[PDB]
Short mmCIF file of C-alpha atoms and ligand atoms in Angstrom, two decimals:
data_model
loop_
_atom_site.label_atom_id
_atom_site.label_comp_id
_atom_site.label_asym_id
_atom_site.label_seq_id
_atom_site.Cartn_x
_atom_site.Cartn_y
_atom_site.Cartn_z
CA UNK D 1 -5.31 20.14 40.37
CA UNK D 2 -1.90 21.83 40.91
CA UNK D 3 1.26 19.79 41.41
CA UNK D 4 4.18 21.94 42.45
CA UNK D 5 7.68 20.51 41.98
CA UNK D 6 9.49 20.21 45.32
CA UNK D 7 13.23 19.46 45.20
CA UNK D 8 14.22 16.46 47.33
CA UNK D 9 15.65 18.06 50.45
CA UNK D 10 19.14 19.41 49.97
CA UNK D 11 19.75 17.56 46.67
CA UNK D 12 21.51 19.02 43.66
CA UNK D 13 22.92 17.98 40.22
CA UNK D 14 25.56 15.78 41.66
CA UNK D 15 23.06 13.70 43.63
CA UNK D 16 20.93 13.04 40.55
CA UNK D 17 24.03 12.30 38.43
CA UNK D 18 24.84 9.57 40.95
CA UNK D 19 21.37 8.05 40.47
CA UNK D 20 21.76 8.33 36.67
CA UNK D 21 25.13 6.59 36.93
CA UNK D 22 23.70 3.73 39.05
CA UNK D 23 20.94 3.18 36.48
CA UNK D 24 23.45 3.39 33.62
CA UNK D 25 25.88 0.93 35.29
CA UNK D 26 23.04 -1.53 35.89
CA UNK D 27 21.97 -1.18 32.24
CA UNK D 28 25.48 -2.19 31.28
CA UNK D 29 25.63 -5.06 33.81
CA UNK D 30 22.24 -6.71 33.22
CA UNK D 31 22.82 -7.09 29.48
CA UNK D 32 21.13 -10.51 29.01
CA UNK D 33 17.56 -9.29 29.47
CA UNK D 34 15.15 -9.93 26.60
CA UNK D 35 17.59 -11.91 24.47
CA UNK D 36 20.37 -9.36 24.93
CA UNK D 37 18.35 -6.27 24.14
CA UNK D 38 18.98 -5.15 27.72
CA UNK D 39 16.65 -2.97 29.81
CA UNK D 40 16.96 0.28 27.87
CA UNK D 41 13.82 -0.04 25.74
CA UNK D 42 11.54 -1.20 28.54
CA UNK D 43 12.75 1.69 30.73
CA UNK D 44 11.86 4.16 27.97
CA UNK D 45 8.44 2.57 27.69
CA UNK D 46 7.98 2.70 31.49
CA UNK D 47 8.77 6.44 31.57
CA UNK D 48 6.26 7.00 28.79
CA UNK D 49 3.46 4.94 30.34
CA UNK D 50 3.80 6.58 33.74
CA UNK D 51 3.56 9.99 32.02
CA UNK D 52 0.97 9.08 29.41
CA UNK D 53 -1.87 8.72 31.91
CA UNK D 54 -2.00 12.52 32.04
CA UNK D 55 -5.19 14.37 31.16
CA UNK D 56 -4.72 18.05 30.36
CA UNK D 57 -8.38 18.74 31.17
CA UNK D 58 -8.16 18.10 34.90
CA UNK D 59 -4.45 17.39 35.57
CA UNK D 60 -5.19 13.84 36.66
CA UNK D 61 -2.58 11.16 36.00
CA UNK D 62 0.90 12.18 34.83
CA UNK D 63 4.37 11.43 36.15
CA UNK D 64 4.21 13.66 39.23
CA UNK D 65 2.64 11.30 41.76
CA UNK D 66 4.58 8.15 41.05
CA UNK D 67 1.33 6.22 41.04
CA UNK D 68 2.62 3.27 38.97
CA UNK D 69 3.84 1.88 42.33
CA UNK D 70 0.18 1.12 43.22
CA UNK D 71 -1.54 -2.09 42.14
CA UNK D 72 -4.32 -0.55 40.06
CA UNK D 73 -1.81 1.07 37.69
CA UNK D 74 0.89 -1.61 37.98
CA UNK D 75 -1.73 -4.12 36.81
CA UNK D 76 -3.17 -2.07 33.94
CA UNK D 77 -3.33 -4.46 30.96
CA UNK D 78 -1.74 -1.62 28.92
CA UNK D 79 1.30 -1.87 31.22
CA UNK D 80 1.91 -5.61 30.81
CA UNK D 81 5.66 -6.20 30.70
CA UNK D 82 6.64 -2.96 32.47
CA UNK D 83 7.04 -4.89 35.70
CA UNK D 84 10.43 -5.85 34.30
CA UNK D 85 11.47 -2.20 34.30
CA UNK D 86 10.07 -1.72 37.79
CA UNK D 87 12.12 -4.69 39.05
CA UNK D 88 15.23 -3.27 37.41
CA UNK D 89 14.71 0.01 39.27
CA UNK D 90 14.08 -1.61 42.68
CA UNK D 91 17.77 -1.78 43.68
CA UNK D 92 18.17 1.83 42.56
CA UNK D 93 15.25 2.83 44.80
CA UNK D 94 16.85 0.88 47.65
CA UNK D 95 20.23 2.58 47.26
CA UNK D 96 18.73 6.07 46.82
CA UNK D 97 15.56 6.01 48.93
CA UNK D 98 15.35 9.80 48.82
CA UNK D 99 14.45 10.06 45.14
CA UNK D 100 10.71 10.25 44.52
CA UNK D 101 9.08 7.48 42.57
CA UNK D 102 8.06 9.70 39.66
CA UNK D 103 11.54 11.17 39.57
CA UNK D 104 13.01 7.67 39.46
CA UNK D 105 10.71 6.35 36.74
CA UNK D 106 11.22 9.40 34.53
CA UNK D 107 14.98 9.51 35.14
CA UNK D 108 15.12 5.82 34.15
CA UNK D 109 13.76 6.76 30.73
CA UNK D 110 16.17 9.69 30.32
CA UNK D 111 19.13 7.52 31.33
CA UNK D 112 18.07 4.75 28.95
CA UNK D 113 17.73 7.12 25.96
CA UNK D 114 21.09 8.70 26.59
CA UNK D 115 22.99 5.48 27.31
CA UNK D 116 21.53 4.04 24.08
CA UNK D 117 23.32 6.91 22.23
CA UNK D 118 20.18 9.02 21.94
CA UNK D 119 19.89 12.75 22.38
CA UNK D 120 20.50 14.47 25.67
CA UNK D 121 17.18 14.87 27.46
CA UNK D 122 17.10 17.72 30.01
CA UNK D 123 15.45 16.51 33.19
CA UNK D 124 13.97 18.30 36.17
CA UNK D 125 13.56 16.92 39.69
CA UNK D 126 10.78 17.47 42.19
CA UNK D 127 7.94 15.09 41.49
CA UNK D 128 6.33 14.12 44.86
CA UNK D 129 4.70 10.78 45.61
CA UNK D 130 0.93 11.12 46.04
CA UNK D 131 -1.45 8.66 47.76
CA UNK D 132 -3.07 5.53 46.35
CA UNK D 133 -6.39 7.28 45.73
CA UNK D 134 -4.69 9.58 43.22
CA UNK D 135 -3.87 6.65 40.92
CA UNK D 136 -5.58 7.07 37.53
CA UNK D 137 -7.94 4.34 36.34
CA UNK D 138 -6.84 1.99 33.61
CA UNK D 139 -7.65 2.80 29.99
CA UNK D 140 -5.81 6.10 29.45
CA UNK D 141 -2.96 4.62 27.36
CA UNK D 142 -3.45 4.18 23.61
CA UNK D 143 -4.71 1.26 21.54
CA UNK D 144 -2.44 -0.03 18.74
CA UNK D 145 -5.13 -1.29 16.31
CA UNK D 146 -6.41 2.11 15.23
CA UNK D 147 -5.79 4.73 12.56
CA UNK D 148 -4.21 8.17 12.19
CA UNK D 149 -7.30 10.03 13.30
CA UNK D 150 -7.36 8.02 16.52
CA UNK D 151 -3.67 8.76 17.13
CA UNK D 152 -4.12 12.46 16.51
CA UNK D 153 -7.14 12.76 18.79
CA UNK D 154 -5.57 10.58 21.47
CA UNK D 155 -2.47 12.75 21.74
CA UNK D 156 -4.45 15.98 22.03
CA UNK D 157 -5.24 14.85 25.59
CA UNK D 158 -1.48 14.95 26.26
CA UNK D 159 -1.17 18.36 24.59
CA UNK D 160 0.93 16.93 21.74
CA UNK D 161 0.74 18.16 18.15
CA UNK D 162 1.52 16.30 14.93
CA UNK D 163 5.25 16.93 15.06
CA UNK D 164 5.49 15.90 18.71
CA UNK D 165 3.51 12.70 18.02
CA UNK D 166 5.65 11.68 15.07
CA UNK D 167 8.85 12.48 17.00
CA UNK D 168 7.77 10.49 20.07
CA UNK D 169 6.80 7.46 17.97
CA UNK D 170 10.39 7.15 16.80
CA UNK D 171 11.04 5.38 20.11
CA UNK D 172 9.51 2.36 18.35
CA UNK D 173 12.94 1.83 16.83
CA UNK D 174 13.82 0.43 20.27
CA UNK D 175 13.19 -3.01 21.66
CA UNK D 176 10.37 -5.21 20.44
CA UNK D 177 6.82 -6.29 20.86
CA UNK D 178 6.02 -9.45 22.88
CA UNK D 179 2.93 -11.49 22.10
CA UNK D 180 2.19 -12.27 25.74
CA UNK D 181 2.31 -8.60 26.74
CA UNK D 182 0.37 -6.84 23.98
CA UNK D 183 -0.86 -9.31 21.36
CA UNK D 184 1.86 -8.13 18.93
CA UNK D 185 5.09 -9.94 18.16
CA UNK D 186 8.48 -9.13 16.73
CA UNK D 187 10.33 -6.09 15.60
CA UNK D 188 13.93 -7.13 16.11
CA UNK D 189 16.37 -6.49 18.95
CA UNK D 190 17.59 -2.91 18.56
CA UNK D 191 19.05 -1.08 21.57
CA UNK D 192 20.65 1.88 19.81
CA UNK D 193 18.64 5.11 19.57
CA UNK D 194 18.47 6.13 15.93
CA UNK D 195 15.99 7.54 13.38
CA UNK D 196 15.58 4.08 11.82
CA UNK D 197 11.84 3.88 12.61
CA UNK D 198 11.24 6.49 9.92
CA UNK D 199 13.65 4.95 7.39
CA UNK D 200 12.07 1.58 7.92
CA UNK D 201 8.55 2.98 7.44
CA UNK D 202 9.54 4.54 4.14
CA UNK D 203 11.94 1.96 2.73
CA UNK D 204 10.76 -1.51 3.73
CA UNK D 205 8.32 -3.66 1.78
CA UNK D 206 5.49 -3.99 4.30
CA UNK D 207 2.92 -6.79 4.32
CA UNK D 208 -0.27 -6.61 6.43
CA UNK D 209 -0.37 -9.95 8.23
CA UNK D 210 -2.22 -11.65 11.09
CA UNK D 211 -0.02 -12.64 14.02
CA UNK D 212 -0.47 -15.61 16.34
CA UNK D 213 -2.84 -13.61 18.57
CA UNK D 214 -5.06 -12.98 15.52
CA UNK D 215 -4.20 -9.26 15.38
CA UNK D 216 -3.07 -7.41 12.28
CA UNK D 217 0.42 -5.96 12.08
CA UNK D 218 2.70 -4.88 9.25
CA UNK D 219 5.77 -7.08 8.73
CA UNK D 220 8.87 -6.85 6.64
CA UNK D 221 11.14 -9.69 5.49
CA UNK D 222 14.03 -8.08 7.35
CA UNK D 223 12.17 -8.64 10.66
CA UNK D 224 10.86 -5.17 11.41
CA UNK D 225 7.22 -4.62 12.29
CA UNK D 226 4.80 -1.71 12.43
CA UNK D 227 1.68 -1.54 14.56
CA UNK D 228 -1.40 -0.25 12.75
CA UNK D 229 -0.91 3.06 14.62
CA UNK D 230 2.74 3.20 13.47
CA UNK D 231 1.78 2.56 9.85
CA UNK D 232 -0.87 5.27 10.09
CA UNK D 233 1.98 7.79 10.15
CA UNK D 234 2.59 7.11 6.44
CA UNK D 235 -1.12 6.85 5.56
CA UNK D 236 -1.98 10.37 6.76
CA UNK D 237 -0.44 13.05 4.54
CA UNK D 238 0.45 15.40 7.42
CA UNK D 239 2.18 12.70 9.42
CA UNK D 240 3.87 11.44 6.25
CA UNK D 241 5.62 14.75 5.63
CA UNK D 242 7.11 14.66 9.13
CA UNK D 243 8.18 11.02 8.80
CA UNK D 244 10.09 12.04 5.66
CA UNK D 245 11.68 14.94 7.49
CA UNK D 246 12.99 12.75 10.31
CA UNK D 247 14.09 9.99 7.94
CA UNK D 248 16.26 12.60 6.26
CA UNK D 249 17.65 14.53 9.26
CA UNK D 250 18.99 12.59 12.24
CA UNK D 251 19.87 15.73 14.19
CA UNK D 252 16.44 17.27 13.72
CA UNK D 253 14.83 14.10 14.92
CA UNK D 254 17.09 14.01 17.99
CA UNK D 255 16.33 17.60 18.89
CA UNK D 256 12.59 17.26 18.43
CA UNK D 257 12.43 13.94 20.30
CA UNK D 258 14.36 15.45 23.20
CA UNK D 259 11.91 18.37 23.48
CA UNK D 260 8.82 16.17 23.17
CA UNK D 261 10.06 13.54 25.61
CA UNK D 262 11.00 16.12 28.25
CA UNK D 263 7.57 17.72 27.76
CA UNK D 264 5.84 14.34 28.11
CA UNK D 265 7.73 13.63 31.33
CA UNK D 266 6.92 17.10 32.72
CA UNK D 267 3.24 17.39 31.78
CA UNK D 268 1.14 18.35 34.80
CA UNK D 269 3.99 19.77 36.87
CA UNK D 270 4.25 23.37 37.97
CA UNK D 271 7.88 24.43 38.36
CA UNK D 272 8.37 27.42 40.72
CA UNK D 273 10.21 30.37 39.16
CA UNK D 274 13.19 29.74 41.46
CA UNK D 275 13.32 25.96 40.78
CA UNK D 276 16.70 24.67 39.56
CA UNK D 277 17.27 24.74 35.84
CA UNK D 278 16.91 21.40 34.04
CA UNK D 279 19.81 19.03 34.53
CA UNK D 280 21.72 17.56 31.58
CA UNK D 281 23.41 14.39 32.77
CA UNK D 282 26.69 13.15 31.42
CA UNK D 283 26.73 9.66 29.99
CA UNK D 284 29.00 6.99 31.48
CA UNK D 285 31.05 7.27 28.30
CA UNK D 286 31.45 11.05 28.72
CA UNK D 287 32.62 10.49 32.30
CA UNK D 288 35.11 7.76 31.39
CA UNK D 289 33.13 5.30 33.54
C1 LIG C 301 -0.10 5.41 19.57
C2 LIG C 301 0.89 5.36 20.48
C3 LIG C 301 1.54 4.12 20.91
C4 LIG C 301 1.03 2.82 20.88
C5 LIG C 301 -0.28 2.32 20.45
C6 LIG C 301 2.11 2.00 21.38
C7 LIG C 301 2.04 0.60 21.49
C8 LIG C 301 3.09 -0.26 21.84
C9 LIG C 301 2.97 -1.69 21.90
C10 LIG C 301 1.74 -2.50 21.66
C11 LIG C 301 4.25 -2.17 22.25
C12 LIG C 301 4.65 -3.57 22.54
C13 LIG C 301 4.64 -3.86 24.05
C14 LIG C 301 5.07 -5.28 24.30
O1 LIG C 301 4.50 -6.20 23.67
O2 LIG C 301 6.02 -5.49 25.10
C15 LIG C 301 5.09 -1.00 22.40
C16 LIG C 301 6.45 -1.04 22.69
C17 LIG C 301 7.27 0.08 22.94
N1 LIG C 301 6.84 1.35 22.99
FE1 LIG C 301 5.03 2.05 22.31
N2 LIG C 301 3.20 2.73 21.72
C18 LIG C 301 2.88 4.02 21.44
C19 LIG C 301 3.69 5.12 21.70
C20 LIG C 301 4.97 5.08 22.30
C21 LIG C 301 5.69 6.27 22.71
C22 LIG C 301 5.18 7.65 22.65
C23 LIG C 301 6.90 5.79 23.27
C24 LIG C 301 7.98 6.54 23.90
C25 LIG C 301 8.43 7.73 23.55
C26 LIG C 301 6.86 4.35 23.15
C27 LIG C 301 7.89 3.50 23.47
C28 LIG C 301 7.91 2.09 23.32
C29 LIG C 301 9.10 1.29 23.50
C30 LIG C 301 10.43 1.77 23.83
C31 LIG C 301 8.69 -0.04 23.27
C32 LIG C 301 9.49 -1.29 23.35
C33 LIG C 301 9.39 -1.93 24.72
C34 LIG C 301 10.24 -3.20 24.90
O3 LIG C 301 11.10 -3.50 24.06
O4 LIG C 301 10.04 -3.87 25.95
N3 LIG C 301 5.64 3.90 22.61
N4 LIG C 301 4.38 0.18 22.19
#
């Protein structure tokens, strides 16, 4: 399958900066969500789950088609909780009805990372909504109870290598787990994008415990948690080296995360040679807004 990016008619940087700014202003305004974490983390997770359905083998799934708007995908058990992000984006969709659904979902994740003081993430427009029958079946997103070999194999389907996997997982610094969504609980209330996932992995005293859903997770006394798949990144010697690298170099982590996250959000999309260059949006803070 080929999905060619098609720029929303007549739109340019300034139009998408306006959408970014509306998302960013709403992030600031609706600060109470999830015990004052705000919507940033769930928007990052939404952007990832709408992209992470991709299969490199046949170009099914992926962000292009905006298929999360359809019930089969909306109701994937793996997506429990993301409805909160969707609801956040509804007024944005209403104000800017011209932006495609995949563009909106992916731009929500970019805006969230940047407004949380993360790296700049270049972003390209032109995803085009596709019909309900193009929605991927449930079961393409990863399980959390597994080991490093599972993680490694899983991410090959998304064309991600060890460095890209470890970099992407650093998003688990953000937000928290919720027992009712995933069968995992805790992790704090962080809404600042940092390399602390890696520092916490290396420096905390982790205990393997059973949570109230009878699933195993690693807990620290300071309130952080690691999923089994997170902890696998320090069990496997190749992953461990990269964890150490990112724990010791904030800038390197930022740069690698930015590349991997853009790639994730763009998997499956063919950009014409004369497509616009990727946009780098200014934060509200940079604009004095
Ligand atoms: C092996 C891969 C991964 C597994 C198994 C996994 C699993 C999970 C689980 C179980 C939760 C808790 C959901 C809930 O209870 O609300 C979660 C949260 C989260 N995940 Fe992942 N994840 C993975 C990779 C990623 C990647 C690649 C990103 C993005 C780059 C990401 C971003 C997030 C964020 C931001 C949250 C917090 C959401 C919130 O606070 O509402 N995850 N993930």
